[PDB]
Design a protein around this ligand. Sequence first.
Ligand SMILES: Nc1ncnc2c1ncn2[C@@H]1O[C@H](COP(=O)(O)OP(=O)(O)O)[C@@H](O)[C@H]1O
Length: 325
Amino acid sequence: PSCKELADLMTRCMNYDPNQRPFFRAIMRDINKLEEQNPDIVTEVDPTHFEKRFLKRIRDLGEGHFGKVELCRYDPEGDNTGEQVAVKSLKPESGGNHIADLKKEIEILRNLYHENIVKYKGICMEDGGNGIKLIMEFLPSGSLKEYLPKNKNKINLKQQLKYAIQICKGMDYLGSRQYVHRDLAARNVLVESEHQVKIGDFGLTKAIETDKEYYTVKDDRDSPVFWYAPECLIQCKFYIASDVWSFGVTLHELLTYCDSDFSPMALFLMTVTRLVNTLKEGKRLPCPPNCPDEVYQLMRKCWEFQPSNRTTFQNLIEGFEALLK
Ligand SMILES: Nc1ncnc2c1ncn2[C@@H]1O[C@H](COP(=O)(O)OP(=O)(O)O)[C@@H](O)[C@H]1O
């Protein structure tokens, strides 16, 4: 509040230690005293903002096609202890337009809430208006691509089924509010501790309209070559079920433990023309080696090039839970 005496009472009542809050009779006594004591009838501590001056670097890890990510510790105290954070930031190299997309990305992560999504922690900026730096939580285990090779033998098919299941709920949550992530792969999907996976960044997020079930792209050079729905080249239109193919490829890699050369780009043997002709001719990739029959038999349906033949994520989790049971 704006009155010195009342703020004291509110602070005493609203203490974070439940055994230090005062008794109600003391509250009544203090209110009665305050009433007669003051005949007069009449800077913020917002934690979501960070300042670069108190950010301390430790090491660098991770990079992307639209920014860099580093590990830092925030400690305005005597630097004895603090909180380890991951700081999404741009780079001066050709950063003439990253500001708008970074602002939009900040906007998206402030309006989402689900368990299978990386938490938002705050924002940071400098005096120049540019230099905006997103700060989000840090996952010690990194992404799945960096985890499965490290524990290929220790892991089990049970946890593989669990991991394949969990990201589907996050994707369904994203599709609920009419968002398309436009890029899904192992490097983006994160894993924390065990049995928990949270989706990574949302840089290329765009929202479709009710009157048009597809988005418009002016330049397709940014998209990766072999995570590419056929409509993205045939008509340059982005549909929600486009990432279903992406999820199927991610599932295949998940069963593959991120092998050295079994990735479809490495597995495949003028790239655009070859891809188009193979898609029209149905030259789909075969099943993974040593793969159980039922899972890839189920996955084969979603790989179908027709968007209409693709199933909803709800149906996929239904099938997966039926198989698990
Ligand atoms: N919250 C986090 N905690 C730990 N590592 C992270 C976090 N977010 C991203 N990374 C690291 O970033 C790498 C993935 O790069 P990413 O930032 O997704 O590229 P892009 O910027 O193109 O999205 C991974 O190797 C992962 O270790």
